[PDB]
Amino acid sequence: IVEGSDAEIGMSPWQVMLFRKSPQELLCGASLISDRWVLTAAHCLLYPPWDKNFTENDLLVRIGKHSRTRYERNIEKISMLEKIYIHPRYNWRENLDRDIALMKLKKPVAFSDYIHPVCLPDRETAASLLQAGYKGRVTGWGNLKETGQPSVLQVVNLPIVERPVCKDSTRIRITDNMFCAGYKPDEGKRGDACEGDSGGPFVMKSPFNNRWYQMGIVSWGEGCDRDGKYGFYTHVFRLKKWIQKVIDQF
């Protein structure tokens, strides 16, 4: 996360860290939505241009973390995966459309003051909150600059941007399954997610019922925090029917 701050303890109890077993490295962010399911971006796992095609046995999911590099004994939990599901229509070939993947944990995790799931939005919440100008929050242990990595979880609050503006900031084709967020050069505020933050959650807090809903998944962006560019996020609600299907079928 670029131009963000250190999160507070228990600020994002649904944040998950996808860790590789060999080498042992931070792969991406993800979120806990159930005691058994984790949501992430599909390019964190499959991205053929760079030969990434990770399987269950190559990953560990660490939940309850704050510190990036330390094993927070008695606080964090590490789970193994049973299955990984990538959206059958994830478009890695062109613009990472439907960049979403679900992972089933081997065993349920128990909630604590540092581990708790985030809610997934319903048509109404999506409608009233996914409006340009409204701010969401992204969290992660990814790069701090484009070209180092933080000691603890970082947070940055960014506004959603009007679709026309997103389309006009790039050559890439934006679909209705994505939304963009970030500040305009003439706003005087910065911030963005960066490499290492993909897969993590873009959440908003409902003013009606005070719950945090995950509206997006950090997907791509051209560089990190460049002026005139924005970060793109997978639109969770548009892909919720797929999410449901996988969870009440497997």
Add this chain to the structure above:
Amino acid sequence: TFGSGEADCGLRPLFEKKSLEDKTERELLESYIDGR
């Protein structure tokens, strides 16, 4: 299950459950044209 989710979702033990606010959530609620 979904419809809503894990029922007690989105409520953080260290914040909402204790009615404590984190330091920048105000910024989000204010951008929704006054969250109160």
Add this chain to the structure above:
Amino acid sequence: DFEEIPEEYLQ
């Protein structure tokens, strides 16, 4: 720079 975690999670 990651710290080692319990062998029981590599398996």
